[PDB]
Amino acid sequence: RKLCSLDNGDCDQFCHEEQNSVVCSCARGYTLADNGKACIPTGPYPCGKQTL
Amino acid sequence: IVGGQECKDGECPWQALLINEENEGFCGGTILSEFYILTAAHCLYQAKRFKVRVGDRNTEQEGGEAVHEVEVVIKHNRFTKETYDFDIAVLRLKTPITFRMNVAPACLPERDWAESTLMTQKTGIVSGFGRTHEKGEQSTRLKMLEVPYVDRNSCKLSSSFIITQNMFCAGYDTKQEDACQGDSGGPHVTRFKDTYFVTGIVSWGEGCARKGKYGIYTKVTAFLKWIDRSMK
Numbered sequence: 001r002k003l004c005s006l007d008n009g010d011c012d013q014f015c016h017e018e019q020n021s022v023v024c025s026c027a028r029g030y031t032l033a034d035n036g037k038a039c040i041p042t043g044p045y046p047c048g049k050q051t052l
Numbered sequence: 053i054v055g056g057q058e059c060k061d062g063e064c065p066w067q068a069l070l071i072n073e074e075n076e077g078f079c080g081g082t083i084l085s086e087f088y089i090l091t092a093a094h095c096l097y098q099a100k101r102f103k104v105r106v107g108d109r110n111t112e113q114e115g116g117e118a119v120h121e122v123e124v125v126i127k128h129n130r131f132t133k134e135t136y137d138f139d140i141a142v143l144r145l146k147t148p149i150t151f152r153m154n155v156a157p158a159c160l161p162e163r164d165w166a167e168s169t170l171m172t173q174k175t176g177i178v179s180g181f182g183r184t185h186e187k188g189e190q191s192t193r194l195k196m197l198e199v200p201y202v203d204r205n206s207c208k209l210s211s212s213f214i215i216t217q218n219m220f221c222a223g224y225d226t227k228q229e230d231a232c233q234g235d236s237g238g239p240h241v242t243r244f245k246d247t248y249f250v251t252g253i254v255s256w257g258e259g260c261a262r263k264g265k266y267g268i269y270t271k272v273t274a275f276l277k278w279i280d281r282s283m284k
């Protein structure tokens with residue numbers, strides 16, 4: 001009953017609705033955080049991040 | 053890029069440039085990983101021999117800029133100049149890119165999430181060293197430009213050529229901002245919470261920044277699986 005259409009299901013990146021709930025996921029080079037929402041880069045040049 | 057601004061350090065790191073033999077960039081690309089560049093299939097017919105540069109922002113000063121030979125070219129088997137449909141290709145490099153300042157890959161999104169979340173944003177970002185006016189000269193500087201997603205129906209009306217479901221339109225009706233010649237093959241990316249995802253490939257336009265005409269981009273969501281397979 002949770003939705004990706006509200007604040008992206010609180011996901012940092014990908015959001016899908018699964019069995020009336022949200023499941024977050026992340027692009028390659030990122031691991032989903034224990035909280036199941038955040039995407040944690042596994043190297044210093046993760047995709048989609050400006051090299052600031 | 054017509055209008056927009058120069059990318060600041062670190063801001064457009066997934067930008068790649070296709071350079072012919074006379075060492076001049078003629079198309080852009082997008083870094084997807086250490087071995088692979090995303091580009092437009094139609095760029096392949098503007099050079100039999102070309103290489104890929106990364107890390108560049110000013111072609112007038114020459115550190116960190118680096119050239120890579122292409123090992124394998126994977127053109128979409130359904131591309132054709134007659135239609136410009138399926139305007140997509142992946143290049144494997146012979147030597148891997150080392151990621152560093154101004155050199156990093158953009159993210160491939162999951163398809164359904166990108167359709168419902170990235171493609172429904174207001175704007176995406178296109179970037180290139182292409183002409184800074186339709187008849188102008190290519191820019192020595194890497195530039196970027198925010199472009200509004202334009203409704204498929206409007207673009208069809210606006211267009212003298214057939215817009216397929218593998219294309220989308222972005223840009224402005226009258227405002228003098230657009231991609232242009234030399235930007236083709238380069239990135240259209242959409243930011244979602246500080247992360248940039250590949251959403252398009254600069255593909256074509258009737259001129260550049262023309263009134264009543266928009267930029268036409270390869271719709272990456274239509275080919276997320278094809279890229280995947282091409283990269284394996």
Ligand SMILES: O=C(CN1C[C@H](NC(=O)c2ccc(Cl)s2)C[C@H]1C(=O)NCC1CC1)Nc1ccc(-n2ccccc2=O)cc1F
Nearest residue numbers: 134135136213231232233254255256257258259260267268
């Ligand atoms: O071939 C060009 C050439 N141009 C492309 C270029 N503009 C762009 O590439 C883009 C603009 C916005 C985006 Cl996004 S890409 C400008 C201009 C040029 O090179 N002039 C050179 C001449 C000295 C003036 N445009 C083009 C390509 C393909 C198609 N096309 C589309 C669908 C079906 C068939 C077809 O030919 C239509 C076009 F108008």
Ligand code: NA
Nearest residue numbers: 224225262265
């Ligand atoms: Na226009």
